[PDB]
Structure 1
Amino acid sequence: SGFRKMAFPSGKVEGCMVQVTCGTTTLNGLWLDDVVYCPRHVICTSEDMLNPNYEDLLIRKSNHNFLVQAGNVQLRVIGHSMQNCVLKLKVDTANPKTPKYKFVRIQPGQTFSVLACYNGSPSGVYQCAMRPNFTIKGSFLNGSCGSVGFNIDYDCVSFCYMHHMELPTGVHAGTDLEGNFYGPFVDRQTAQAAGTDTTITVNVLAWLYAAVINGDRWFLNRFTTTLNDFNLVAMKYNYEPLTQDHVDILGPLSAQTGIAVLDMCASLKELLQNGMNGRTILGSALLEDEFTPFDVVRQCSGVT
C-alpha cells in the first residue's frame, strides 16, 4: 500500500544522454544507435532566437562544428540533418548502451517520466503529464534542453518528448522525437499563447480509485450520476468531458473496487461542488490528475 508520483527507473535513458555543443550553445542530446538527437536551437546564438532562420543557420554549420561528448569520450560526427525542430547527428559509433526503443507521440492527458539533464549529465527524474493544452509543468533550467520524456514497457523505452523551451508563463514546451512540437508552439523567443488548459477527468477518477484501494474512502457517497449530468459539472469546473472510452478504460479499477464508474463520478461531482473541507486524499489537498488509469493499475499491481 501507499501511492506515490512514481517515475520509471531512468537507467536505460541515462545511458543515452550526451552533451551537444555548437559554437557557444551547449544542450543535451539523446544517442540511440548511431544517431544523436537534440533540439535544433543548439545552432542559435542568443541574438538568433528572436526570429531564427534555422535553414540558413544550419547551412553555416558543418559536421565538425557539432561537438558531441558522452561522459568523457568524444563522438565523431559524420552526418547532420534537420527533421522539423530536431537535429539528427549521425555518429561513426553505435551507442553500446542503446536500449530497445520506440519513438511515440503521446496523447494529451497521458503521463511520462522526464530525465532532467545538464551538460549531458542526469540531475533527476520526475513523473509528469502532458496537459490537455500540450504543455508540461516540468522543472527545467537553462541547459536542460534536450532532456527527454519516456515510458518503459518490459525492456522497451518509448521516447515521447524532448524538451525545447520555457514559455514566459513558466510552463514547458517541447517536441516528439521526430521534432514535431506538441501544441501550437514554435522554437523562437516570442510570447506564445498556451491554450485554455483543463483538468484530466479520467486521471482524477483513476486516482480516486487508487485512494479507495489504499484506504482513503471518506469521499465515497450514497449518490450516483449520469455521463450527461456529470459533464455539466465537469464543464463548470473546467474538467475534460468524460466519454464512454474513458469509462471503458476505468473498467479494471471499477471491477477491482466494485465501485461503478458513475458512482465514482458522483463522488467527484460532490468533491468539485463542496471541495475537500480541509481533508486530504492520498496526501493531497487537491484533485490529482497526473495518474492515468494504466499508471494506477501498474502501481497497485507492481509491474516491473
Structure 2
Amino acid sequence: SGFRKMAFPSGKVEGCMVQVTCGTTTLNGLWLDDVVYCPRHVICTSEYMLNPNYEDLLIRKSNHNFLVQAGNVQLRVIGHSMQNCVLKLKVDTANPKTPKYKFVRIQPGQTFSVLACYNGSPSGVYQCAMRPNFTIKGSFLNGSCGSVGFNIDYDCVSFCYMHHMELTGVHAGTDLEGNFYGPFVDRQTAQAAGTDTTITVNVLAWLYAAVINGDRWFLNRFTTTLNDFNLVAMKYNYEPLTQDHVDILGPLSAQTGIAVLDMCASLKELLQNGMNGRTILGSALLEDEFTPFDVVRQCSGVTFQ
C-alpha cells in the first residue's frame, strides 16, 4: 500500500538525449534513428528572440553550423529541415539505443513523465499533468529546452511533449511534430496563460486511491445527480463532469464498491465545508494530477518490458 507521485522509469529515454549547439546557444535534442529533434529557437541569436523570422534564420545556416554531441561522441549533421516549431537534424549514425516509439498528442488532464536535461545530460525525472489551459507546472532552468515528456505503454515509449519556454512561473511546449500546446508562439512577447481549472475526474480518482489506502473520513451516505454536482463544481472552478468520466472511473468504483455519484456527493461536501484541518493521502488540498489510469496502475501494479 501507499501512494506516491510516481514517474515512469526513464532508462529508455536517457539513451536518446543529446546536446545540440548552434552558435553560442546550447540545448537538448532527442535522437531517434538518424534524426535529432530539438526546438527551432536554437538557431536564434540573443538579438533575435523578440521577433524572429525562422525561415530567414535557417536559410543562412549550413550543416556544419550544428554541433551535435552524444556523450563524448560527435554526430555529423548531413541534413536539416524545419517542421513547425522543431528542427529535424539528419545525422550519419542511427541511434543504436532507439526504443520502439510513437509520437502522440495528449489532451488536458492527462499525465506524463518529464526527463529534465541540461547539456544533453539527464538531471531528474518527475510526473506532471497537462493543465486545462495547456501549460504544465514543471521545474525547468536555463538550458532545459529540448527536454521531453513521455508515457510508457508496455514496451513502447510514447513521446508527447518537448519543452520550449517558461511563461510566468509555468511552462509551455510542443508535441513532437512541433505544434504548440495552447495558443503560444516561440518568441519573447507578452503572452499569458488563460485561467486554469481543477481537473474533476482526476480529483475523484485520487479520492478512490484514498479509500483503497484506508482514508475514509470524508465519505457520507448521500448521493447526487450529475447535473446537481456540475452546478456546484462550476462555482469552484472545477471542470464539469461527463458520463464519459463516470464510465472511466468504473473500475475504481467496482473495486471499492462505492458508486461514482456517491463519491461526487463527498467531493461536493469537501468543496463546500473544506478540509477542516484533516488530510487525505498526506495532502491538505484536493490533488488533481493522478488520472484514473494512474491510480489503477499504482494500486494494482503494472510493469513494463
Q: TM-score, normalised by structure 2?
A: 0.99
Give the Cα separation in 2 of the matches to 1:205 and 1:135: 22
CA-to-partner distance for each residue in 1:97-116, whole Å, 9 max, x for gaps? 11110000001100000000
CA-to-partner distance for each residue in 1:99-142, whole Å, 9 max, x for gaps? 11000000110000000000000000000000010000000000
Cα deviation, residue 8, structure 1: 0.1
CA-to-partner distance for each residue in 1:189-217, whole Å, 9 max, x for gaps? 11212111110000000000000001111
CA-to-partner distance for each residue in 1:61-84, whole Å, 9 max, x for gaps? 111111110111000111101001
Give the Cα separation in 2 of the matches to 1:81 and 1:252: 46
Aligned equivalent of 1:95: 95
Aligned equivalent of 2:151: 151
CA-to-partner distance for each residue in 1:150-194, whole Å, 9 max, x for gaps? 000111000000000001x11000000000000000001112121
Give the Cα separation in 1 of the matches to 2:202 and 2:45: 40
Greater shift, 24-33 or 188-197, is seen at: 188-197
Give the Cα separation in 1 of the matches to 2:29 and 2:131: 24
Give the Cα separation in 1 of the matches to 2:240 and 2:151: 26
SS in 1 for 2:56: helix
Give the Cα separation in 1 of the matches to 2:74 and 2:216: 55
User: Identity of counterpart residues, as a percentage?
Assistant: 100
SS in 1 for 2:49: helix
CA-to-partner distance for each residue in 1:1-57, whole Å, 9 max, x for gaps? 000000000000000000000001000000011100000000011221111111111
Supply the RMSD in Å over aligned alpha carbons: 0.6
Give the Cα separation in 2 of the matches to 1:218 and 1:53: 58
Give the Cα separation in 2 of the matches to 1:57 and 1:275: 54
Give the Cα separation in 2 of the matches to 1:265 and 1:162: 35
Give the Cα separation in 2 of the matches to 1:46 and 1:265: 51
Matches within 5 A, 1:1-304: 1-167=1-167, 169-304=168-303
Cα deviation, residue 282, structure 1: 0.6
SS in 1 for 2:160: strand
Structure 1 residues without counterparts, runs of 5 or longer: none
Q: TM-score, normalised by structure 1?
A: 0.99
**Number of residue pairs matched by the alignment:** 303
Give the Cα separation in 2 of the matches to 1:190 and 1:280: 41
SS in 2 for 1:253: helix
Give the Cα separation in 2 of the matches to 1:233 and 1:294: 25
Cα deviation, residue 222, structure 1: 1.5
Give the Cα separation in 1 of the matches to 2:259 and 2:9: 33
Cα deviation, residue 295, structure 1: 0.5
Cα deviation, residue 60, structure 1: 1.0
CA-to-partner distance for each residue in 1:251-286, whole Å, 9 max, x for gaps? 100111100000010111111111111111111110
Cα deviation, residue 248, structure 1: 0.6
CA-to-partner distance for each residue in 1:198-255, whole Å, 9 max, x for gaps? 1000000000000000111111112111111110111000000000000010010011
Give the Cα separation in 2 of the matches to 1:214 and 1:58: 55
